[PDB]
Symmetry: C2
Subunit: 569 residues, 2 copies
């Protein structure tokens, strides 16, 4: 149950962002042992919310902290909210949360990239309250992303910095006590007419509802009094890639009111094409990251607008949420700009045996299904989402992974019978044991970088050969979901060398030549959109330098050649 | 007399380069007053030759030195040289030289970019000798480049750093006592046959001489026993831009032997065109500088080859020896590679009243004529030189500059009737007073940088309008001899901004569009070839950054766009 909070005449949002008080444990779980939540925090510093905490201070100990940290602020409940339902919402807490209201625990959460909330109607006092949030960053074999602890040092095999903090907005909001809990929308098209299937869940199903469908002019085009209905939109304005159209499911229920934007669009996979509204779609874009200077993974909407301007400028039509769900604000923006999205759960780091009883096991599986349920509940109504990605680069050569991912694939397909399912490959085509469960084959391939570094002449034959093998083995359309080269801005050389701006351009260009000679490729996603931070390592010059743009969102040389190609496509 | 030294059966060269001993004056002219030359130098450091001294040490006092420094080394005269004529040659000493041999002064020279020599046949001893060289860097109103001293601080209004030292090889060489002193070669073409007019001077004009003209496979194609003659070369292999062919004037005189490469090629200026061998030539290239890391203006032949590879790669066909004569090794390289050269004397810095009796006056004028004579005598036989430039950016709006440059132009025309004469403009077209004396009008224009900085849309109309005015006022073909923009490697921005790599490309692009619409433009020379060092100033980020290549000879982004254009012309 996770409708995005709204403001209208009936519902109201109180943002709890700004500056909080903050302190870290000085030994493992010190805050829980000493019950720091039972009184205000002492010996604290300021910490912005939303933001990672790791890059804010000058303190290497805080940057590299392993374990739990403690946030605290105060909030008020006005007299005017006296008889309302009160909800405290967290867009995310990375990775693990324990929430305390006035010294008492009210909820917990596992998973750093999906929202959660707590009903505090009967617990919050009028006037001042104290909100205390314990934030833990430890990843074990039953978390997503996967990791483990050694003796404490945090180990993991994914390539992005394990930022921790309150990365997304914290909201206290009110609704009437009889209210709209959940909404599902599915759409079909018969030539010119759209059909809108909706289902609305309330906590008083016998009472009266009024449902409108409004166009972008806010004009009513359909109307009903049923909580579940199928309604026809004559001459429907379809939601198109690069040309969004959003209708509004506008719902009056008792004293309550909720308005849900949605797009009318169809998806169909053929043998070798990806069809949106019947017309072939070729993915041009990037896997991204929630990453920028100072604030780590913290939501930054000005950064988001800049990134969308860059995506439009360079001719991209799509992105993948590597390697975790992004903020709903980004998903709303993609809905509005007509950007096509591959939505991914954080099942990353399942690589180096990995699928064994003492590591990635049935407990990991059950949590993997739960994360998918939550992702679906949050994003099921976004027209921008066209595909679910259930994993990034698992060690799928292991025979034990076959049963694991058959279970995961069956689960998401039971939740959602309409969008294709996929996941990205890094093992050899000959060894993979899971891609047969997918509708689209996605491969991460770094010819000219991790294979044959510097050997420009070998990139084109290498990727073409591999692509054909992937198509011959599975007979499905193929997306190259990652390829590129680390590139230091300002590093030029003639003849070109790895890390130079010229090499990045040539590397991408030869990979593209291989893709252009295949008839079953339905997309190219360059890695990476922008330089981002990684865990420290000798192959990472202050992070991952595969960005086509710098971390400050300025283009390297290759960006202009990619634009010339994508704008002609 | 200044024939380039050669090695053969009769003549021998001894290089005196390597590591010398070095010391600077601690007060003005300390070394002269204390007669340091009378005994070996004491309290010295090592200094390499050839090289500037400014960038070698970690000492700011030496880098910014004003006045004189002292070089010394030892050389040997072999027993085997017993009865030969002995000559000490300096390729250059910047700017002023006093030469001592075994403690006695033997010659002086004024001007930092042209060679000079001294006959030491009767003054060097068999075995060890001591060679001492005083090197002065002070420029006054009668030097070229122009400058002046204020109270000691050196002032000047040219860009580049006032490097000083022994910048070109020092050579002791030997010839027989009766020998070839000078050679002048001129060529004409009648349809398919070439006519080689030569004049040879010796110090015994009555003695027998034998003169061969040899082709590139060293086979005799013409023969004569005259000191001055006119011999036919049937079916002559012409020297062409991009395809050099060099004949050899191979001269046997008594015991002496000298071999002089030369090329057969015609130059003709028409209304609107610059014809070489009767075919229109469009200059594509750069003004350069003698400048690189560590060694300042020191000759570096490895760097010279790299620059010619770069010029070839980028599609250039020419350069101008911006603001002073270059080393002969580079002129020889241009002869062999077919690179067309504009050869320029150091009349730079006559700008801020400049042409007054207390500044640039008749003493300056007479020295300017002498430098031209020395330049002509050195470079008259190079087929690569197609045009003389007698000044760079003088304040030619002053009425007094008219008689000055009419006199300079008429002098150079008497020395050489075959090659066109020019000089580069920076004053406004309405105020210029000297360009009517030239055969080609050369303008330095920085629209988008020094005028309307950052205003990309104003570049094309401004340049086209100025170009038309120059053509209409003088009716001669036009070269844009400088244009461009400072650019920090690695500085990228979208939208572009001055100093970014993207801006340099667009600025050059928009200037090129203006030139392409003008049927009277016969050349474009971008400023600059490579980043180089300047006197310190708030507009100069560790030198002039207008290079298309960095100072380490690697390309910035714009280099690739220039290459596409120049290579399809
Ligand atoms: Ca959110
Ligand atoms: Ca020389």
């Amino acid at each position: 149950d996770m409708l995005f909070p709204v403001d209208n005449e009936a519902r109201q949002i109180k943002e709890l962002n700004g500056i909080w008080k903050f302190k870290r444990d000085n030994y493992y779980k010190q805050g829980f042992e000493e019950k720091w939540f039972e009184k205000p925090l002492e010996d604290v510093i300021d910490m912005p919310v939303p933001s990672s905490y790791n890059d804010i201070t000058t303190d290497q100990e805080l940057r590299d902290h392993v374990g739990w940290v403690w946030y605290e602020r105060k909030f008020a409940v006005p007299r005017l909210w006296k008889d309302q339902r009160l909800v405290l919402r967290f867009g995310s807490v990375t990775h693990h949360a324990v929430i305390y209201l006035n010294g008492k625990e009210i909820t917990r959460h596992k998973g750093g990239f999906l929202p959660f909330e707590a009903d505090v109607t009967e617990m919050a006092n009028e006037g001042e309250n104290r909100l205390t949030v314990a934030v833990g960053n430890i990843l074990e074999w039953d978390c997503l992303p996967v990791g483990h602890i050694e003796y404490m040092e945090q180990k993991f095999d994914f390539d992005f910095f394990n930022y921790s903090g309150i990365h997304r907005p914290v909201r206290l909001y009110c609704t009437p006590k009889e209210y709209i809990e959940d909404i599902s929308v599915r759409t079909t098209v018969d030539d010119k007419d759209g059909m809108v299937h909706y289902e609305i869940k309330t906590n008083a199903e016998e009472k009266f509802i009024k449902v409108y469908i409004r166009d972008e002019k806010n004009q009513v085009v359909a109307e009903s009094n049923e909580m579940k209905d199928m309604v026809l939109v004559k001459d429907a304005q379809l939601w198109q890639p690069g040309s969004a159209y959003l209708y509004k499911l506008d719902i009056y229920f008792g004293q309550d009111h909720y308005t849900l934007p949605f797009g009318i669009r169809t998806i169909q996979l053929t043998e070798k094409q990806f069809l949106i509204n019947g017309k072939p779609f070729y993915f041009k874009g990037f896997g991204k990251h929630e990453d920028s200077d100072i604030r780590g993974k913290g939501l930054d909407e000005a950064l988001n607008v800049r990134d969308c301007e860059l995506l439009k400028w360079i001719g991209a039509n799509s992105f993948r949420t590597s390697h975790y769900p992004y903020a709903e604000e980004m998903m709303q923006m993609a809905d509005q700009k007509g950007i096509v999205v591959i939505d991914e759960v954080p099942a990353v780091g399942m690589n180096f045996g990995i699928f064994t009883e003492d590591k990635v096991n049935e407990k990991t599986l059950a949590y993997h299904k739960q994360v998918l349920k939550e992702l679906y509940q949050r994003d099921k109504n976004h027209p921008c989402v066209v595909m679910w990605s259930i994993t990034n680069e698992p060690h799928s050569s292991e025979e034990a992974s076959r049963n694991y991912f058959e279970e995961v694939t069956k689960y998401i397909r039971k939740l959602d019978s309409e969008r294709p399912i996929t996941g990205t490959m890094n093992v050899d085509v000959e060894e993979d044991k899971i891609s047969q469960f997918f509708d689209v084959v996605c491969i991460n391939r770094y010819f000219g970088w991790y294979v044959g570094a510097g050997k420009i002449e070998r990139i084109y034959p290498s990727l073409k050969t591999d692509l054909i093998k992937w198509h011959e083995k599975y007979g499905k359309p193929v997306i190259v979901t990652e390829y590129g080269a680390d590139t230091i801005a300002g590093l030029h050389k003639l003849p070109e060398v790895i890390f130079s701006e010229e090499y990045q351009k040539r590397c991408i260009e030869e990979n593209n030549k291989a893709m252009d000679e295949c008839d079953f490729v339905i997309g190219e996603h360059i890695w990476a959109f922008a330089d981002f931070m990684t865990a420290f390592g000798l192959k990472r010059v202050d992070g991952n330098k595969k960005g086509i743009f710098t971390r400050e969102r300025q283009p390297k040389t290759a960006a202009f050649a990619i634009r010339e190609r994508w704008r002609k496509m």
